[PDB]
Amino acid sequence: ASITDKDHQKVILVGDGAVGSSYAFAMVLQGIAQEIGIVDIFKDKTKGDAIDLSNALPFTSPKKIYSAEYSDAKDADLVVITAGAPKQPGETRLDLVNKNLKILKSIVDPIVDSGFNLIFLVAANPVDILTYATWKLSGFPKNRVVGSGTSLDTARFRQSIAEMVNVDARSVHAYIMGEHGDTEFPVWSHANIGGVTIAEWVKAHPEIKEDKLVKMFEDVRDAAYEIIKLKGATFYGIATALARISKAILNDENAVLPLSVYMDGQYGINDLYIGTPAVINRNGIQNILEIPLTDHEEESMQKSASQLKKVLTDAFAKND
Amino acid sequence: ASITDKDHQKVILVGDGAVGSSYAFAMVLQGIAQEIGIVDIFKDKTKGDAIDLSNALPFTSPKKIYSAEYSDAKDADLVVITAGAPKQPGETRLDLVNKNLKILKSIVDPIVDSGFNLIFLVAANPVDILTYATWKLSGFPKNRVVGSGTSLDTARFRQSIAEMVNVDARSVHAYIMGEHGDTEFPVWSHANIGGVTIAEWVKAHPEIKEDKLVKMFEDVRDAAYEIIKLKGATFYGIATALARISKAILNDENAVLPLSVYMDGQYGINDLYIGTPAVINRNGIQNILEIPLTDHEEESMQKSASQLKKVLTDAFAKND
Amino acid sequence: ASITDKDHQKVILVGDGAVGSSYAFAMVLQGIAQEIGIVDIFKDKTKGDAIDLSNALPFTSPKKIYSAEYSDAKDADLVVITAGAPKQPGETRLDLVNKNLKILKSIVDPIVDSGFNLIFLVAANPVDILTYATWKLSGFPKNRVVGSGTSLDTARFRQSIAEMVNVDARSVHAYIMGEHGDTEFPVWSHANIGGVTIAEWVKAHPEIKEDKLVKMFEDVRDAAYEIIKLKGATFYGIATALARISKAILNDENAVLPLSVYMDGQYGINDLYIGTPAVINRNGIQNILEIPLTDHEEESMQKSASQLKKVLTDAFAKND
Amino acid sequence: ASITDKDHQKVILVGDGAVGSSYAFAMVLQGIAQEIGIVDIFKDKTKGDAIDLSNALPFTSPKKIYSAEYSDAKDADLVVITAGAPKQPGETRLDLVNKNLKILKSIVDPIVDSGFNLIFLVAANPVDILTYATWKLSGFPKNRVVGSGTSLDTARFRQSIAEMVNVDARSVHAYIMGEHGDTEFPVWSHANIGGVTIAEWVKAHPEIKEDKLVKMFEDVRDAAYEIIKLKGATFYGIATALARISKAILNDENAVLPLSVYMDGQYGINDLYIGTPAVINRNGIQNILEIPLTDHEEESMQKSASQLKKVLTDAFAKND
Ligand SMILES: O=P(O)(O)OC[C@H]1O[C@@](O)(COP(=O)(O)O)[C@@H](O)[C@@H]1O
Ligand SMILES: O=P(O)(O)OC[C@H]1O[C@@](O)(COP(=O)(O)O)[C@@H](O)[C@@H]1O
C-alpha cells in the first residue's frame, strides 16, 4: 500500500500565542498528536514556535508541525481554538462577547468551508458564552462543540483540598460548576478524598459560621488575577488541561470531565452553555451527569446560568 | 495533502461537573485524546474548565478542548455521558430510573441526529439500568453501548486484598459482579495474587464462620457513602477508571474489564444489563467471559439480576 | 458491531535489518503502533525478529507484528523505508544515488499498487536525494513524502551544547540544516538554552578566532564515522529519532522538527530536497519555518543545496 | 546545597554485547535510569554504544552513560550481569557451569571490593545455577541476588494462550516454573484469562488425550532455538524483561514476578536456586508465593529442581 501521509490523527491550533505554544509543547511530549497545525494571524511566531517544537522531537513521539491557515484545516481530528481571544479578561462580563465575536467569525468560517467534521474545543474566554457562539456559527451539533471552562477551576480546588491534607491529586475529588469565576460554586456536597467526604459526617457542617473553610475558593476563583501579575501567565495550568481534555476525546476514553456541554434539562437551566461533569469520547460528548445540588448549590447554579442568558442574549445578534 | 483538522480521535464529555472535569484532566495527562468536547447544560463552568485544561497543555500531549452542544457531536470516536445524573444516590433503587430518564433523553437524542456511529460510555448512576436505557433510545447495537459499573467496585476490592498483604495492585486479581452496591458478590472463587488463590487450598474456606474475611467488602460497597461525606467526591476513583476503560476501547487493546455488557445467556439472567468480565476494543465489546460461580455466587448473581427486571421493567415506559 | 480487525493505525517497515529492528523495538515500547508489518528481502530474519518483538509484549501495549511483502501494504497509516540502503556510506556523494535507485524502485512500486495513501518516511541514506527520489516515483505529493535527515544531526549538536553545561536535553535548543554531513551548518544564530543565546550578548562572537567553539561539530558531523567502528551501529540514535518523528505524524501533534521537506522558495534554493525546521501532522507536513540565516549561514545553506542539484541532477534518469 | 552529582539511582551493565545494548536502549526510553555504566572486556563497543545511546537522549529522560570498569561500580542501585556468558547455549547442562564460573569470578569480585550494597540481577545462562553461583561468591544475602529465569518463559506462554484467543497480554495469566528449558512445566492449573480458567470447568481436562493443547509449549521452550537461527537474537524479548524486572526492584513496586529466588521450603526442593512467582521491591525480594501444584506439576517441579543439585553440586568447587 502506497503513496503516503500516515497520520490518522490531526489537531489544529488556532493560537500560537501563550496558551497555544504550551498546549503544543505538551501535545509534543505527552505524545497525543500525529500532525499538528499551528495558526494565529501572525506567521513569524509560528515558523519560530515550529522550528523549536519540531526540534523538540528526538526526545519524543514524532509528527509534523507547520503553520497553517485554513486549507490545511481539514484532515483534522480536533480543532483547538486556544485563546482566539480579545482583551477584557474574564468573569463572564457583558460586551466582551462582542470584541471576540468577530474574531470568532474571522476564524470559525474558514475552518468550516474546507470540510471540518470533528470536535471544536474552544478555550478562549469567556468560555461558556463562547461555545454557544462557536456552535451557532458552525451549525455543528450539540456535541462536537466541546467547551472547556470548569476543568481549570476544579484542578485548582482539588489542589487546595490537597496541600491542606497530604493526599496526592488524582485521588482527591470535588468539582466546580457554573462558569468560570464570579458565579462558581464548589460542589462540597460531593467533596471527597479516599471515599470519605468533607463535612457531612466527620468535619462538621456549615460554611462561614465556624472559622475554617470557604476561604480557599475565595482564592481559587481569585487565583487567576493573582497570577495576572507575575507574567500574566495563567497559561500552563490551562494548557495542561486542554491536553487531558484533548487526550480524552480522540483516544476515546469514555472519560469523566467538567466542560461546558449544552444542557437540555440536564438541570433546568436550559439552552445556555454552562457546565458540569460530563462524559467525552472521540465523536464528541455522550451523556451529561447531573447532580443533586442539595438546596443551595441548586440556587448558586440557577443564578450563574441566569447571568448568562443575559450576556448570551444581549449579544447573539451577528452582523459584527 | 491540504486543508485541515488532524484529529482521528474524538471524545465527547456530557458532564463538565465533577466526574467529567476529572475524566478530562486524566485524558489530558494520560494522553488519550486528540480533541475533547465538553458539555453540560451550563456554559460558564465549561469555558472555565477549558481555559484551565487547555492551559494544562505545555506539560502534555496537545489537543483542542472547547464547549459543545450536539453539532460538534459527530466526528466523534467516543461519547462519555459522565454523570448525566439525577440526585437520588445509587444502589439501584426504583423511581431513580425516572428522574434521569428524561435527562437521558434531553441528551441522547441530539447526539444521535448529527450522526453518531461509535461507542456510548455511560457512567451515570444507576448504571446497569441506564445503559439499557441508553441502548433503547439510541437504536445503537448491543455493543457500542458500553456500560460501566463493576470497574470501580473491583478496583476497590483489589486494594483491600492488597494493603492486607504487600503486593502491588495490577498484580492482585479478583472481581466484583452484579451491579453497583447492594447486590454485589465478590468472586472470591477466582481471587488471586501471584497465581495463588485465597482460601481453597491455603487460607481455608468459609465466610462468617472463622472471624476474618468478608468485612472488607462490607466496606467496599459501603465505601462510597463513606466518602459521600468529605466532599461527596467519589469522583477521582471513577474518572481514573473511565480513563482505563476509555483508553481500552479506542486504543484497540482487546482488553479485559468488567462493564455492564448485555447478557445473551452469557449466564442465564438474560436481557438486562448487569455485568461481568468482558472484552472491549475500538468497535465496541467483542465476547463476554462467563464464570463458574460455584453454587453460591451463582445465587447471588441470580438475585442481583432479578432486582433489575423490576426497576428496569417498572420504568421503560417512555413518554417522560 | 461485528467481524474484526481493530487497528486504526498501521506502519510498514521496509528494513528488518539494524535500524529497522530498532525502530521496531521502540515502536513496541513507546507504544505508537497498532499493527506493524516487517519487510526486507529475506524472510528468516523477519520471522525471527517478530517472534522476539511479539514476545516482548506482556510488558507493552499490544499489537500484531508479522512479515510482509506488499499486499499487506495497504491498510497502512505510515510507511517507513528504513535503510532501504546500499553500501557507499553517506555524505551526499554522487553515484550512490544510483546503487539505491533501483532498490528504491524494487520497493517503491509495489507499496503503491496495493493502494498506499499516506506518508512515506525514508530514512535511507543519502536522505535528501532520496526523498526527491521517493517522491518522483510515487506521484505522491510534496508532503506525504517526509524525508528525515537533520533530526539526527541536531540531536547530537544539542547534546554537546549540553554536557559542556549542565542543562538537560529537551531544554537546550539549536538546529542543524542543509543535509547530512559535509555541508552542514549549525544555526548558532538561534542557539539557546533557557531563552538565552550563545554568543551574541554573553559568550562573545566569532568562530575560529578565540580558541573555544566549532570543534564540537567538527565532531558532530564526524560523529557517525567514529561509530562506524565499534559495531557500525549508528543504529540506535537514528531509530529513536524515527520514533519521535513517527509519533508526531500519526499522533497529529502539529509538532516542530527538522526533516527534508521540499522548498518552494521557503529559502531560495528551490526544487531540491534539503531541509529545515518544518511542521508535521497526521496528513503530512503543513508549513515550513524559514530562518534569518544571518549572512553566513545563508551562504553555507546556499552551497549545500547546490551540491545537491548536482547529485540530484546527474541521476534522476530512471531506467536503472 | 552545593557541589554535585544528582543521581540517586545507579545501574551497572556488565555486558555491552547484545542483551546488554538492548537492556540499555530500553532503560533509556522507558526511563528507569539516572546514570548507567556500561562494561564488557572490550572498550571499543562501549564508547560506541554510549555515543549512540547518549545521542538517543533529546527524545528521552536524561542521564549519563559511560564505560566503566569496577571503580565506577559502587554508588550503584542495581547491577545487571547481563550475559556475562559463555558459549554452550542453555538447557541447564552440566560443565557449562564451569566455563562461566571463572568469567563470573573475573567480574563478581571487583564489583564487590568497591562497596556494592544492592541487588545483583544475573541474566546470564544457565540462570538458576548461576545465581547460586553469584550468591556464594558475593556473600550478599538470600535476596539481593535476584536471579531471572522464568520471566521469559511465561511471557511467551502468555502470548500463545493469547493469539489463540483475542485477549491482550497483560490480561492473560499463567506461569512457567522450574528453570529455563528442558524441565519446565506450565502451571496450567492456575491458567486464566479474565478470571476464567482453562480446562477445569470449561475446556475439559487432559493433556495428550484430546488432540489440542500442550503443543504450544513444546514450542515455547523450543522457542529459543527457533530464533537461534535468524540472527541468534533471543535478545529483545529478554532485555525487555530485564527492564520490567528492573523497574520493579528500584521503583519499589512490591510487584509480582517469577525469578529464581532461593527456596527455604517454599516448596520442598530446598537450597538450589530454581524459581516461582515471588515478590520484589527496592531492597530485594520479600516473600515467595508457593503454589498447589496439583499432583503432577508437583512432580515436574520436583524433577527439575533435582537436575540442578547435580549440575549445582558437581561444580561449586571453586578454584577455577
Ligand atoms: O506483573 P509482572 O510482575 O510485570 O509480571 C509480568 C508477567 O507475569 C505473569 O506471569 C502474570 O502476573 P499477574 O496475574 O499478577 O498480573 C505473566 O503473564 C506476565 O507477562
Ligand atoms: O486489566 P484491566 O482491563 O485494566 O482491568 C483492571 C481491573 O481488572 C481487574 O478486575 C483484574 O484483571 P487481569 O487479571 O486480566 O489482569 C482488577 O483487579 C483491576 O483493577
Cα D18 from Cα D239, distance rounded (Å) = 9
Strand D36-38: give its sheet, edge to edge: D36-38, D11-13, D78-80, D120-121, D145-146
CB atoms within 10 A of CB B159: 15
Helices (H), chain C: 18-26, 44-53, 96-99, 127-138, 151-161, 236-251, 296-302
Distances (CA, A) of C243 to C20, C81, C169, C176: 11, 13, 17, 19
Q: Rounded to the nearest 5°, which phi and psi values hold at B7?
A: -125, -85
Cα D284 from Cα B173, distance rounded (Å) = 23
Helix (H, G, I), strand (E, B) or coil at C56: coil
Label residue B254 left, alpha or beta by phi (over 0 means left) and psi (-120 to 50 means alpha): left
Residues ≥6 apart with Cβ < 8 Å to B90: B125, B126, B180, B181, B224
The C-alpha cell at C239 is: 531509530
**DSSP assignments along chain B, one per residue:** --SB---S--EEES-BSHHHHHHHHHIIIII--SSEEE--BBSHHHHHHHHHHTEE-TTS----B---EEETTSSBSEEE-EE---SS-SSS-STHHHHTTTTTTTTTSTTTSS---S-EE---SSHHHHHHHHHHHH---TTTEE--TTHHHHHHHHHHHTTTS---TTT-B--EEBSSSSS-EE-TTT-BSTT--SSSSSS-S-SSSSSSSSTTTTTTSSTTGGGSSSSS---HHHHHHHHHHHHHHHHT----EE-----SSSSS--SS--B-EEEEETTEEEEE-----TTHHHHHHHTTTTTSSSTTTTT-----
Distances (CA, A) of B175 to A196, B86, B191: 23, 28, 7
Cα A56 from Cα C186, distance rounded (Å) = 16
Lookup result for grid cell 519521535: C244
In this structure, the residue with its CA closest to atom 11 of ligand 2 is B173
Lookup result for grid cell 444502589: B91
Let me know: does B14 contact B84? Beta carbons within 8 Å: yes
Ligand 1 binding pocket mutation candidate from B171, B190, B197, B198 (most atoms within 8 A of CB): B171
Query: In 3D, which of B291, B237, D184 has the Cα closest to residue A174?
Result: B237
Cα C282 from Cα C265, distance rounded (Å) = 24
Residues ≥6 apart with Cβ < 8 Å to A273: A127, A128, A129, A131, A132, A135, A147, A260, A261, A262, A263, A308, A312, B39, B42, B43, B44, B46, B47, B67, B68, B69
Instruction: Label residue C218 exposed, middle or buried (CB < 10 Å: 0-12, 13-18, 19+).
Output: exposed
Instruction: Label residue A298 exposed, middle or buried (CB < 10 Å: 0-12, 13-18, 19+).
Output: middle
In this structure, the residue with its CA closest to atom 6 of ligand 2 is B257
Ligand 1 centre to CA of D173 (Å) is 7
Residues ≥6 apart with Cβ < 8 Å to C296: C185
Let me know: does D269 contact D302? Beta carbons within 8 Å: yes
The C-alpha cell at B149 is: 459499573
Report whether residue D247 contacts ligand 1, using a CB cutoff of 6 Å: no
DSSP symbol at C28: I
Let me know: does C273 contact C131? Beta carbons within 8 Å: yes
Cα C133 from Cα C260, distance rounded (Å) = 12
Q: Ligand nearest B242 Cα, by number?
A: 2
Yes or no, beta carbons of D279 and B166 under 8 Å apart: yes
Residues ≥6 apart with Cβ < 8 Å to A213: A188, A199, A207
List chain A domain ranges.
Answer: 1-149, 150-319
Helix (H, G, I), strand (E, B) or coil at A130: helix
Query: In 3D, which of B8, B283, B64, B307 has the Cα closest to residue B178?
Result: B307
Q: From the CA atom positions of chain B, what is the Rg in Å?
A: 20
Helix (H, G, I), strand (E, B) or coil at C59: coil
Cα B168 from Cα B154, distance rounded (Å) = 15
Could you identify the atom of ligand 1 that is nearest to the CA of residue D248? 3
Let me know: does A59 contact C275? Beta carbons within 8 Å: no
Distance from CA of D85 to the nearest CA of B (A): 30
Cα D150 from Cα D147, distance rounded (Å) = 9
CB atoms within 10 A of CB D314: 12
Domain B1-149 fold: Rossmann fold (3.40.50)
Cα D130 from Cα D136, distance rounded (Å) = 10
Q: Rounded to the nearest 5°, which phi and psi values hold at D241?
A: -85, -40
Cα C264 from Cα B313, distance rounded (Å) = 68
The C-alpha cell at B118 is: 461509535
Q: Nearest chain B residue to C7 by CA: give it.
A: B252
Residues ≥6 apart with Cβ < 8 Å to A18: A83, A233, A235
Distance of CA A309 to the CA centre of its chain: 20
Helix (H, G, I), strand (E, B) or coil at C113: coil
Residues ≥6 apart with Cβ < 8 Å to B17: A150, A175, A177, A187, A258, A275, A276, A277, A278, A289, A290, A291, B40, B45, B83
Residues ≥6 apart with Cβ < 8 Å to A143: A119, A261, A262, A283, A284, A285, A286, B12, B14, B37, B39, B68, B69, B70, B71, B72, B73, B76, B79, B110, B111, B114
Could you identify the atom of ligand 2 that is nearest to the CA of residue B255? 3
CB atoms within 10 A of CB A31: 25
Q: Rounded to the nearest 5°, which phi and psi values hold at D162?
A: -55, -115
Report whether residue D289 contacts ligand 1, using a CB cutoff of 6 Å: no
Distances (CA, A) of C252 to A7, A62, A78, A236, D219: 6, 9, 9, 21, 40
Let me know: does B147 contact B273? Beta carbons within 8 Å: yes
Residues ≥6 apart with Cβ < 8 Å to D150: D175, D176, D177, D178, D180, D258, D259, D260, D275, D276
Let me know: does C108 contact C41? Beta carbons within 8 Å: no
Residues ≥6 apart with Cβ < 8 Å to C141: B1, C284
Residues ≥6 apart with Cβ < 8 Å to A139: A112, B71
Ligand 1 centre to CA of D131 (Å) is 22
Cα D167 from Cα D152, distance rounded (Å) = 19
* Strand-strand pairing, B257-258 and B120-121: unpaired
Experimental technique for the deposited model: X-ray
What would be the CATH architecture of the domain defined by D150-319? Alpha-Beta Complex (3.90)
Distance from CA of A21 to the nearest CA of D (A): 19
Let me know: does A49 contact A269? Beta carbons within 8 Å: no
Cα B269 from Cα C84, distance rounded (Å) = 58
Give me the active site residues of A, please. Answer: 180
Query: In 3D, which of A126, A67, D201, B12 has the Cα closest to residue C290?
Result: A67
Cα B181 from Cα C124, distance rounded (Å) = 59
Query: In 3D, which of D30, D32, D16, D31 has the Cα closest to residue D82?
Result: D16
Q: From the CA atom positions of chain A, what is the Rg in Å?
A: 20
Query: In 3D, which of C11, D165, A250, D167 has the Cα closest to residue B247?
Result: A250
Cα D173 from Cα D291, distance rounded (Å) = 14
Ligand 2 centre to CA of D286 (Å) is 24
Task: Kindly state the helix (H) or strand (E) to which residue A153 belongs, with its residue range.
Answer: helix A151-161
Q: Is B222 on the interface with C (CB under 8 A)?
A: no
Cα C230 from Cα D40, distance rounded (Å) = 13
Query: In 3D, which of D70, D72, D63, D73 has the Cα closest to residue D118?
Result: D73
Distance from CA of C308 to the nearest CA of A (A): 23
Residues ≥6 apart with Cβ < 8 Å to A91: A126, A180, A181, A182
**β-strand partners of A63:** C248
SS (H, E, C) chain D: CCCCCCCCCCEEECCCCHHHHHHHHHHHHHHCCCCEEECCCCCHHHHHHHHHHCCCCCCCCCCCECCCCCCCCCCCCEEECCCCCCCCCCCCCCCHHHHCCCCCCCCCCCCCCCCCCCCEECCCCCHHHHHHHHHHHHCCCCCCEECCCCHHHHHHHHHHHCCCCCCCCCCCECCEEECCCCCCEECCCCCECCCCCCCCCCCCCCCCCCCCCCCCCCCCCCCCHHHCCCCCCCCHHHHHHHHHHHHHHHHCCCCCEECCCCCCCCCCCCCCCCECEEEEECCEEEEECCCCCCCHHHHHHHCCCCCCCCCCCCCCCCCC
Q: Rounded to the nearest 5°, which phi and psi values hold at A95?
A: -65, -5
Q: Nearest chain C residue to D5 by CA: give it.
A: C166
State the resolution, in angstroms.
3.0
Yes or no, beta carbons of C255 and A64 under 8 Å apart: yes
Ligand 2 binding pocket mutation candidate from B151, B154, B196 (most atoms within 8 A of CB): B154
- Note whether C1-149 and C150-319 share their fold: no
DSSP symbol at A227: G
Residue D180 is among the residues annotated as catalytic for this protein? yes
